[PDB]
Design a protein around this motif. Structure first.
Motif, PDB file in Angstrom:
ATOM      1  N   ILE A   1      25.345 -15.469   8.762  1.00  0.00           N
ATOM      2  CA  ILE A   1      24.887 -15.449  10.146  1.00  0.00           C
ATOM      3  C   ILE A   1      25.957 -15.994  11.086  1.00  0.00           C
ATOM      4  CG2 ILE A   1      23.252 -16.404  11.799  1.00  0.00           C
ATOM      5  CD1 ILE A   1      21.213 -16.497   9.460  1.00  0.00           C
ATOM      6  N   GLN A   2      26.512 -15.115  11.915  1.00  0.00           N
ATOM      7  CA  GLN A   2      27.546 -15.509  12.864  1.00  0.00           C
ATOM      8  C   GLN A   2      27.261 -14.935  14.248  1.00  0.00           C
ATOM      9  OE1 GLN A   2      31.480 -13.782  12.173  1.00  0.00           O
ATOM     10  NE2 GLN A   2      32.426 -15.497  13.270  1.00  0.00           N
ATOM     11  N   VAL A   3      27.384 -15.776  15.270  1.00  0.00           N
ATOM     12  CA  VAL A   3      27.141 -15.352  16.643  1.00  0.00           C
ATOM     13  C   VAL A   3      28.389 -14.726  17.255  1.00  0.00           C
ATOM     14  CG1 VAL A   3      26.760 -16.160  18.996  1.00  0.00           C
ATOM     15  CG2 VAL A   3      25.283 -16.973  17.143  1.00  0.00           C
ATOM     16  N   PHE A   4      28.342 -13.415  17.467  1.00  0.00           N
ATOM     17  CA  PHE A   4      29.470 -12.694  18.046  1.00  0.00           C
ATOM     18  C   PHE A   4      29.052 -11.963  19.320  1.00  0.00           C
ATOM     19  CE2 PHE A   4      28.283  -8.364  16.684  1.00  0.00           C
ATOM     20  CZ  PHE A   4      27.236  -8.687  15.842  1.00  0.00           C
ATOM     21  N   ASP A   5      30.039 -11.529  20.096  1.00  0.00           N
ATOM     22  CA  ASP A   5      29.775 -10.815  21.340  1.00  0.00           C
ATOM     23  C   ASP A   5      29.217 -11.759  22.400  1.00  0.00           C
ATOM     24  OD1 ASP A   5      28.360  -8.662  23.207  1.00  0.00           O
ATOM     25  OD2 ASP A   5      29.654  -7.566  21.809  1.00  0.00           O
TER      26      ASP A   5
ATOM     27  N   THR B   1      23.862 -17.463  33.105  1.00  0.00           N
ATOM     28  CA  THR B   1      23.119 -16.934  31.967  1.00  0.00           C
ATOM     29  C   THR B   1      24.060 -16.540  30.834  1.00  0.00           C
ATOM     30  OG1 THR B   1      21.356 -16.068  33.407  1.00  0.00           O
ATOM     31  CG2 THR B   1      21.507 -15.168  31.170  1.00  0.00           C
ATOM     32  N   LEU B   2      23.830 -17.111  29.656  1.00  0.00           N
ATOM     33  CA  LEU B   2      24.657 -16.818  28.491  1.00  0.00           C
ATOM     34  C   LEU B   2      23.969 -15.812  27.574  1.00  0.00           C
ATOM     35  CD1 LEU B   2      27.397 -18.673  27.867  1.00  0.00           C
ATOM     36  CD2 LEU B   2      26.172 -18.984  25.709  1.00  0.00           C
ATOM     37  N   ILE B   3      24.765 -14.965  26.930  1.00  0.00           N
ATOM     38  CA  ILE B   3      24.232 -13.956  26.021  1.00  0.00           C
ATOM     39  C   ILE B   3      25.165 -13.737  24.836  1.00  0.00           C
ATOM     40  CG2 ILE B   3      23.114 -12.806  27.956  1.00  0.00           C
ATOM     41  CD1 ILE B   3      25.314 -10.493  27.267  1.00  0.00           C
ATOM     42  N   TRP B   4      24.593 -13.336  23.707  1.00  0.00           N
ATOM     43  CA  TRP B   4      25.375 -13.089  22.500  1.00  0.00           C
ATOM     44  C   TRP B   4      24.658 -12.107  21.579  1.00  0.00           C
ATOM     45  CZ3 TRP B   4      23.521 -17.839  24.099  1.00  0.00           C
ATOM     46  CH2 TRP B   4      22.356 -18.291  23.465  1.00  0.00           C
ATOM     47  N   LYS B   5      25.395 -11.552  20.623  1.00  0.00           N
ATOM     48  CA  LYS B   5      24.830 -10.599  19.676  1.00  0.00           C
ATOM     49  C   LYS B   5      24.811 -11.180  18.265  1.00  0.00           C
ATOM     50  CE  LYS B   5      25.791  -6.123  20.331  1.00  0.00           C
ATOM     51  NZ  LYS B   5      26.135  -4.688  20.140  1.00  0.00           N
ATOM     52  N   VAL B   6      23.630 -11.204  17.657  1.00  0.00           N
ATOM     53  CA  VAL B   6      23.477 -11.732  16.306  1.00  0.00           C
ATOM     54  C   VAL B   6      23.523 -10.613  15.271  1.00  0.00           C
ATOM     55  CG1 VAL B   6      22.163 -13.328  14.872  1.00  0.00           C
ATOM     56  CG2 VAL B   6      21.913 -13.392  17.364  1.00  0.00           C
ATOM     57  N   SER B   7      24.123 -10.902  14.121  1.00  0.00           N
ATOM     58  CA  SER B   7      24.237  -9.920  13.050  1.00  0.00           C
ATOM     59  C   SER B   7      22.974  -9.901  12.193  1.00  0.00           C
ATOM     60  CB  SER B   7      25.455 -10.225  12.177  1.00  0.00           C
ATOM     61  OG  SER B   7      25.994  -9.037  11.621  1.00  0.00           O
ATOM     62  N   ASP B   8      21.821  -9.967  12.849  1.00  0.00           N
ATOM     63  CA  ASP B   8      20.542  -9.956  12.149  1.00  0.00           C
ATOM     64  C   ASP B   8      19.391  -9.725  13.124  1.00  0.00           C
ATOM     65  OD1 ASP B   8      20.574 -10.376   9.211  1.00  0.00           O
ATOM     66  OD2 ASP B   8      21.808 -12.119   9.733  1.00  0.00           O
TER      67      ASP B   8
END
Length: 104
Positions: free
Chosen positions: A9-13, A25-32
């Motif tokens: 599980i790594q927070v990317f994007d 506002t913060l946002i990110w893409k999770v690999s799950d």
């Protein structure tokens, strides 16, 4: 194929959808997304005078009462309950406030 890095599980994007003077506002893409249950994000803001932090269950997190024209270091660390992935770092730069304090 192979087995080594894949499978974690790594927070990317990690990007800022909106960066205001006193908010962002913060946002990110999770690999799950399939098992995106019990997912928690530990935010750790570090300014100049003091630091802040906030935990959310969504891939987004806004930081209220922010400062303009100041560097900030946010660290979004994923947590699927009793797990720990890689903290997502993202450098943000708040815009210059069109309002200035007048002493006297």
């Amino acid at each position: 194929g192979s087995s080594g890095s894949s499978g974690a599980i790594q927070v990317f994007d990690v990007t800022a959808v909106n960066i205001s003077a006193t908010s962002l506002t913060l946002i990110w893409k999770v690999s799950d997304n399939e098992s995106s249950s019990n997912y928690t994000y530990k935010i750790h803001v570090a300014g100049e005078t003091d630091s802040s932090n906030l935990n959310v269950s969504e891939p987004r997190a806004v930081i209220p009462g922010l400062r303009s024209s100041t560097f900030y270091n946010i660290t979004v660390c994923p947590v699927l309950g009793d797990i720990e992935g890689t903290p997502g770092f993202l450098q943000v730069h708040t815009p210059p406030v069109p309002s200035g304090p007048s002493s006297g």
